[PDB]
User: Fold Proline dehydrogenase from Bradyrhizobium diazoefficiens.
Amino acid sequence: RVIQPGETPDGTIGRLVKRLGAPAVRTATRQAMRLMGNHFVLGETIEQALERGKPGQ
Amino acid sequence: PNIPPPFTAPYAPDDAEIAARLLPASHLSPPQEARIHRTATRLIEAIRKLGGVEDM
Assistant:
């Protein structure tokens, strides 16, 4: 997809961007990424979650 | 031109009279305000992207 400039900032993210600025939103998303990756064991299916959360210990 | 006299402006004039001149003169056309708004938004977006005393 290609994004046209000067788009009215709507949605939860657009409202976030009007408030904090786009750069801070990117930074907040990267922090959410560390949280999601470190504190959750997730997958599309349970087999994928379970394989990801494995430790012969 | 002449060396100016020793500086002696009134010390504490009335704010309202000053505001009566400064308020109309601060007016800016819509495209002037638009450029100001964009530049300033970009500067603040960068600010909100290190460390300073205020942060501590």
